[PDB]
Amino acid sequence: VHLVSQASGAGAYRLLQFLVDTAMPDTVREACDRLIQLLLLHLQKLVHHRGPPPRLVPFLDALKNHVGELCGETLRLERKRFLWQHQLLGLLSVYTRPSCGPEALGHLLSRARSPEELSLATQLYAGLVVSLSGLLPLAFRSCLARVHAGTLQPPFTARFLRNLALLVGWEQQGGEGPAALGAHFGESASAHLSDLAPLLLHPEEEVAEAAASLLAICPFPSEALSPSQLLGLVRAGVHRFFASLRLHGPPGVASACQLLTRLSQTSPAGLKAVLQLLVEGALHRGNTELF
Amino acid sequence: IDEMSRRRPEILSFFSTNLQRLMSSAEECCRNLAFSLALRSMQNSPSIAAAFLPTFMYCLGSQDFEVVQTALRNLPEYALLCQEHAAVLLHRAFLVGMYGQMDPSAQISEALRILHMEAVM
Amino acid sequence: DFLLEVCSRSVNLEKASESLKGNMAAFLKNVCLGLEDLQYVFMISSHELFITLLKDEERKLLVDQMRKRSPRVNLCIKPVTSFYPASASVNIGQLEHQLILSVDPWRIRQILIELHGMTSERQFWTVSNKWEVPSVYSGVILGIKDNLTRDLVYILMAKGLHCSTVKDFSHAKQLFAACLELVTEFSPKLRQVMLNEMLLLDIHTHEAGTGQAGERPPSDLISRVRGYLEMRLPDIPLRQVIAEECVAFMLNWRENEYLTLQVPAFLLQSNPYVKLGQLLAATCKELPGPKESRRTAKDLWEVVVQICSVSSRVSLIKQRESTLGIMYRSELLSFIKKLREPLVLTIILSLFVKLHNVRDITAEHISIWPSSIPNLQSVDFEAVAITVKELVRYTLSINP
């Protein structure tokens, strides 16, 4: 463990992959998974200690480049390999002074399919929030910046927005879980409303629906909405309403309707903007064939 | 960090993530300094410039107009440092220019001239 | 159910034309779409008329679409663990992980007790560098005689401070209350320090979602704020940030009467935030009276001019020192980042934009600040420009 931790400053992701693969001969496998557990304990001892100059873990410094593949292997959901890679991801995120944790969280949210993989994402956040701060604003900001760039291709974008909607709704679904976690998914995603309204006009249908559902449930900012912010949300919302009414008919309309209703309840200015733009788009040369 | 990098330009790779976030900051001089150091960083190491792409066009798309202005100022240098993404970069620059009220024609044209001399003639 | 009764009585099932049945089914589908509560779409879907009118797959599609319209999910919240022990050191590592993860003070006490049961003393306060306790408390915590008590105090307050930082106020309440109950026997200094931390956390809890709709403080918290401001105890270590929060709390909750009148003067002579808050409260309260407002306008104007003036080569923002004011420009700005009251904020905005205008822009209360200022060349107007830009950004963050 001292050799593989304190000195492995090379392509040790291959070393870790081989080690975990051995845990997937028989006494060799038992010794190797035990060794993996001791290695995790040793890395935890290395990272969380002495408290002030820092330490240096070449093994973790090797893995931070492969954090994306590390997240990908975690989502495979094995019997306990994903547990080892999850704990390793947590120690890695703590170890990096620039706090690579938000990147890991963005990857987990933008790649997960099942709600159990979201449970992995929440478990990472729960393990990380005891030591680090502001992870959710940073993760959302980085992920949305990647969405607005050519990176993070639209299937992953739609998955990210779907998982984000699930987290926000789960928080609204008040219980012991959201109470204990204290993630504040709604208070964080509310900050990026202005970055979410363009995604509601995306050419990709799955991205547009996912953004529409997320904004349908996501709370508005703590005080109120800016007039430009409110007008952009209302214009995007009515466009999404008419586009989805054209596409899926009345079945595919509820999310945009809920968003517009909430935006009307915000203020008389929001109410007047919603009504004006809604009926004006209703009477336009386009969308009038719908009626 | 600026004075050490002037002595030791190799040190900027460590700070890349931090001043990816500081070059989106609202403060003017701090953002300009973060932009200068980031450009120096990826000019020393032309491989890492692609990592600054999402934050660069976030700066282009930011609602803070000063951030957009300083991103447009630094547009030809970064586009020349990116090339494989200079297409989407200059397309975003044009879109923010035309739907906004800024005129990126000088910067976008200089970048186009340089990368045309790169690509075709 | 009455609508369904009318529906069933008026359809003439299996005798009407397929057009009537199709329109009937469409109406039932769309009234199902328009509903919000799921029991209503279930009771419409359970109707014999509904299940007869449409086919099977389409009604199944309808009900699953309505169910997935408002899905319910549950997620794991317990942190990931692959533990099971193997050895004494393996048990030590597992317990250290559990100590890092836990936030419940009873579990902290249990883990620390058993850890000291199977270790010499080992000073387990050091087992996470991510536990920052401010330096003003380092000596008074590490000055504890008992190793278990010292570790308990350090871990409890470090985790409480972090939970306060990450807005987990309930667990911070738990940890700080446990630390207070622990130190009540040992020392009164640590008791007073922990009471101040309790006060700061309570201020933060109220300024969080408990407030934010104009609901008043409990008025025992207000008395606590007054008491901490007027405690006058030198032997107790202190953080001026708590005094900042207290002054900002008084200003935010419009306790102008206390700051203007009930304040003691030794606090003014010591604390700059207290005297600045006094000028702010006096200036806002005296606004309808021109002559009455004018004196406090010149006083607050002068003190901020000193704050935003450099000592007559490196600039104020470049130096952070060489400022003749009662505190740094950065400290003043960070203090008024804690103010949410629109009247106080617009008063400071009017003052900072008058400073910008003299060496235009118009604010609500520009008139009350004099144009002629002494020490004309000492003012670092670049710093004033930066300050007014950040300040107006903050105010728009408060109320767009």
GROMACS .gro file of C-alpha atoms in nm, chain A residues 97-99 102 138 141 145-146 148-151 194-195, chain B residues 14 17-18 21 24 53-55 57-58 63 85 88 92:
model
   28
   97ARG     CA    1  -0.697   2.150  -0.388
   98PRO     CA    2  -0.898   2.288  -0.686
   99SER     CA    3  -1.174   2.049  -0.562
  102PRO     CA    4  -1.795   1.936  -0.886
  138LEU     CA    5  -1.993   2.477  -0.895
  141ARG     CA    6  -2.218   2.597  -1.335
  145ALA     CA    7  -2.114   2.575  -1.926
  146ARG     CA    8  -2.034   2.244  -2.092
  148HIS     CA    9  -2.366   2.572  -2.371
  149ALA     CA   10  -2.043   2.467  -2.539
  150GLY     CA   11  -2.022   2.196  -2.803
  151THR     CA   12  -1.913   1.951  -2.534
  194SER     CA   13  -3.128   3.226  -1.706
  195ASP     CA   14  -2.897   2.951  -1.832
  305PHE     CA   15  -0.181   2.423  -1.174
  308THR     CA   16  -0.927   2.548  -1.298
  309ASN     CA   17  -0.924   2.837  -1.049
  312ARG     CA   18  -1.368   3.064  -1.274
  315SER     CA   19  -1.584   3.481  -1.545
  344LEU     CA   20  -1.352   2.628  -2.428
  345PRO     CA   21  -1.672   2.588  -2.216
  346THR     CA   22  -1.579   2.874  -1.985
  348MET     CA   23  -1.798   3.069  -2.459
  349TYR     CA   24  -1.978   3.095  -2.128
  354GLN     CA   25  -2.532   3.840  -1.941
  376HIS     CA   26  -1.310   2.468  -3.200
  379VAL     CA   27  -1.801   2.725  -3.298
  383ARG     CA   28  -2.076   3.226  -3.110
   0.00000   0.00000   0.00000
